[PDB]
Design a protein around this ligand. Structure first.
Ligand SMILES: COc1ccc2c(c1)C=C1c3c(ccc(OC)c3O2)C(=O)N1C
Length: 123
């Protein structure tokens, strides 16, 4: 396994915004409880899951456990930065797999719920 994505970085500028607060309290914590959330709650363990090709294909890994810790650590500058991490997580799934796979059906449903929840954010 590669090292997991960082969740802290002292020289990176931090910020707390209403939208980032909402992304943790509402968006992530709601997605987390979905029946299809479990494959996305932690970095992919290529050794445990027997996916030796995973990090040969996926060069910008991301998962909701990392995102949750980044939100809790006020790692992001703005909501768009966190939204980009969700989008990276979803697109990684589509890239590593192919249409119709169970894991892709799961990501497709989670992506639709995610878009529903970020359609309107606080001001
Ligand atoms: C307990 O956490 C788990 C357990 C098994 C899981 C995953 C995470 C997450 C996966 C995953 C993918 C592809 C194949 C796969 O299994 C063949 C798979 O399995 C994939 O793209 N992601 C994100």
């Amino acid at each position: 396994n590669p090292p997991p994505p960082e969740t802290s970085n002292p020289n990176k500028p931090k910020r707390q915004t209403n939208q980032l607060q909402y992304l943790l309290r509402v968006v992530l914590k709601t997605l987390w409880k979905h029946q299809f959330a479990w494959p996305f709650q932690q970095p992919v363990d290529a050794v445990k899951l027997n996916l030796p090709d995973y990090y040969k294909i996926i060069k910008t890994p991301m998962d909701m456990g990392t995102i949750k810790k980044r939100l809790e650590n006020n790692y992001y500058w703005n909501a768009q930065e966190c939204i980009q991490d969700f989008n990276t997580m979803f697109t990684n799934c589509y890239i590593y797999n192919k249409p119709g796979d169970d894991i892709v059906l799961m990501a497709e449903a989670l992506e639709k719920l995610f878009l529903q929840k970020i359609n309107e954010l606080p001001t």
